[PDB]
């Protein structure tokens, strides 16, 4: 039974147990994982502090990125304040190295953290904890543990938590984590100064007021609230909080979002309306692997007012079928590889095998390099 | 009366005359621009030689940068070789310090060379200077006369010339060079250094196996290629070269790729359909500011099959008015703010007043910092 953490659980472990036993066709896709792997065991591991422009604090272990749908405004003569394009990122993001380099980190420790985790060796264990270490908790390397800066608009007067989402890259390496504890690697002391960093990043998430603000947010930025949070306090096992957080937070919050017809109105008036429409769900999906693995299925289980996450699903089925035939904003493409985690995932949450079946018969790439495709040998 | 160079002088004399004469709406406007190019007079001066990531030959004088659609493939080991998605900005194109550095060079080149010869203060050429001296000629910060590693493509066998397109962004800075002639600050011996630089870029586009191939091109790069050329080559007072450009290349050029209802059908096949036939029809424009200063109207001169460029202006204008008509694969929205320059380039040039009207109709803000509006007050 695997620890707890931020992954479908249950395919896990049967790629774990699989292995084990020396089934062949599993052994012959770790040994493909395993080659994906290499590139993390050599790759230098990544800094929040790798960084020119700093934060307002002057400190570069604070995290800094900038709201990617903001511009300079011509007609002024600094280009302050910045407005808002929505769904038009700026290029100025990739100028803030932490955008990307979290997302380089969160692969590479989850990567290898999976891996250690089906396969047992120790290089994998000893890799994971060189890049958890660095990022999290080395005492000049590491980031604090707040996310003040995350997504700041130059110009902008108020304070926002708008830019919190982005904890999701590196929370999920928090979670796989867990999975390394046990190794020679993973000393007894980076488990405490890990846990007192993912402590103070969950005092931060709970009590700052951009944390407060976010947690309240009425679209997708609430969902993936709490599916960061979770993975914080899954990482700390703190199981009766997840209970909570799924009974009085995420299902209240899902409930409001849901309109009769199954749509989601508050992603419908956006420029990228099927891209966050999708996006949604996935916090709700990352949240249930978690609530999932103690008994919670957030699928299934309706809210207060009686709607239900499936009655979302339904609407936008037919649309990952045929995503041309979306009917609202949409600038860019649509990624249909997505739809296939995602009904996989609600389609057993929901015994739906309509779902299950499309899934598999859109599927991900056998020998695909993207990390977060690792438990889904059954897609493949 | 203007020296040959990549603008309109039309509107150029224009804008120097009524504010010698001391006219009050010119007089405004050339102080708003002043305003707007203090920032370029402090700004320190860019070099393609800073990156880290050096190209095949080892030199950081040579540019570099990636071609824009083509992505990692996930499915190999080491994302090799790259694979093309037709309209896709892969955003690996920011780590090319380049890309962007060219974009800020000749905006402050081309908006200091403009001032200059509107206002004459020589702070406006000692800036502008100081600019083309380091991005062209210096010993060490100078940009090598070629773009043989202009697009490369990781895992790509064959020579390409595609990237050749990149050059309009510094050869509108050199063609600008131009004004600053007979100022204090641009020495004799700098304008030779520019010259001899001048003269081996257009030997490497006529005679290299890349500029060979790429002035062949049957779609809008061939154009943009001619475009480029005659930048090059109206810098260098070759005149008579610019006749013959025009008669035997570009006029060809036109005669293929319109088609016998106006559509550019090179351009209907791509992602961004609308984007493209735009793009070549630029391409024409900003050739023909050049080709029209001797007399050579590129919008209704007949090819030698009767076609004229104004039929592809024709095609496209209804879609101008409304982006939304357009029928072919256009997967990002179409920035309708481009017709006006486009328009009112073509619409006078041709007598046209529907053009004219309808591109002051849509307009450009007047205060805006875009460099290359400056000219265009008529639509502010
Ligand atoms: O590229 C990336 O970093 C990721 O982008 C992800 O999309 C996120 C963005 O990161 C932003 O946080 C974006 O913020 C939005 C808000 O969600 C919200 O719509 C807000 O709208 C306000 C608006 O600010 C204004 O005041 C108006 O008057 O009221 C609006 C309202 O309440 O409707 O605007 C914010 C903003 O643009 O700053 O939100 C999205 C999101 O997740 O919703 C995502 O695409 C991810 O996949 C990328 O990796
Ligand atoms: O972002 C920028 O740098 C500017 O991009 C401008 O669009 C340019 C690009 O910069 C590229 O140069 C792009 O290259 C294209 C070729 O034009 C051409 O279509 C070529 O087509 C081949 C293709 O290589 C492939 O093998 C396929 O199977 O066959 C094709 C064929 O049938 O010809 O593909 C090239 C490539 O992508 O490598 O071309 C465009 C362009 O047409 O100019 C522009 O958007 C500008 O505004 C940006 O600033």
């Given at each position: 039974s695997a620890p707890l953490g931020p992954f479908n659980a249950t395919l896990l472990e049967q790629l774990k147990n699989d292995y084990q036993k020396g089934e062949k066709e599993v052994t012959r896709y770790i040994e493909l994982q395993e080659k994906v792997a290499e590139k993390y065991i050599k790759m230098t591991p990544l800094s929040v502090t790798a960084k020119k422009k700093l934060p307002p604090s002057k400190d570069?272990?604070?995290?800094?990125?900038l709201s990617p749908f903001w511009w300079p405004d011509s007609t002024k003569i600094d280009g302050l304040p910045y407005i808002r394009k929505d769904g038009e990122r700026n290029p100025?993001?990739?100028?803030?190295?932490?955008?990307?380099?979290?997302?380089?980190?969160?692969?590479?420790a989850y990567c290898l953290g999976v891996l250690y985790?089906?396969?047992?060796?120790?290089?994998?264990?000893?890799?994971?904890?060189?890049?958890?270490?660095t990022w999290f908790t080395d005492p000049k390397l590491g980031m604090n543990p707040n996310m003040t800066y995350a997504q700041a608009v130059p110009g902008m007067k108020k304070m926002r938590g708008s830019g919190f989402i982005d904890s999701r890259r590196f929370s999920?390496?928090?979670?796989?984590?867990?999975?390394?504890?046990?190794?020679?690697?993973?000393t007894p002391s980076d488990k405490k100064k890990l846990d007192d960093w993912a402590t103070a990043f969950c005092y931060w998430m709970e009590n700052?007021?951009?944390?407060?603000?976010?947690?309240?947010?009425?679209?997708?930025?609430?969902?993936?609230?709490?599916?960061?949070?979770?993975?914080?306090?899954?990482?700390?096992?703190?199981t009766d909080r997840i209970?909570?957080?799924?009974?009085?937070?995420?299902?209240?919050?899902?409930?409001?979002?849901?309109?009769?017809?199954?749509?989601?109105?508050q992603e419908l008036k956006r420029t990228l309306s099927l891209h966050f429409s999708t996006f949604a769900l996935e916090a709700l999906m990352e949240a249930?692997?978690?609530?999932?693995?103690?008994?919670?299925?957030?699928?299934?289980?309706?809210?207060?007012?009686?709607?239900?996450?499936?009655?979302?699903?339904?609407?936008?089925?037919?649309?990952?079928?045929?995503?041309?035939?979306?009917?609202?904003?949409?600038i860019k493409p649509?990624?249909?590889?997505?739809?296939?985690?995602?009904?996989?995932?609600?389609?057993?949450?929901?015994?739906?095998?309509?779902?299950?079946?499309?899934?598999?018969?859109?599927?991900?790439?056998?020998?695909?390099?993207?990390?977060?495709?690792?438990?889904?040998?059954?897609?493949?």
């Open positions: 570069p272990r604070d995290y800094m990125t100025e993001v990739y100028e803030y190295p932490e955008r990307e380099n979290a997302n380089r980190f969160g692969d590479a985790y089906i396969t047992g060796k120790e290089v994998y264990a000893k890799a994971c904890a060189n890049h958890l270490r999920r390496a928090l979670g796989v984590a867990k999975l390394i504890e046990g190794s020679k690697s993973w700052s007021t951009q944390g407060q603000r976010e947690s309240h947010a009425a679209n997708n930025h609430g969902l993936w609230y709490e599916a960061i949070h979770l993975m914080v306090l899954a990482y700390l096992d703190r209970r909570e957080v799924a009974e009085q937070s995420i299902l209240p919050k899902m409930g409001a979002q849901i309109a009769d017809d199954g749509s989601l109105p249930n692997q978690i609530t999932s693995q103690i008994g919670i299925n957030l699928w299934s289980t309706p809210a207060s007012n009686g709607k239900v996450a499936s009655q979302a699903v339904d609407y936008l089925y037919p649309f990952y079928l045929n995503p041309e035939d979306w009917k609202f904003k949409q649509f990624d249909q590889s997505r739809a296939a985690i995602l009904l996989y995932e609600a389609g057993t949450a929901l015994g739906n095998q309509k779902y299950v079946d499309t899934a598999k018969r859109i599927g991900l790439k056998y020998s695909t390099s993207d990390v977060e495709t690792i438990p889904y040998l059954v897609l493949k």
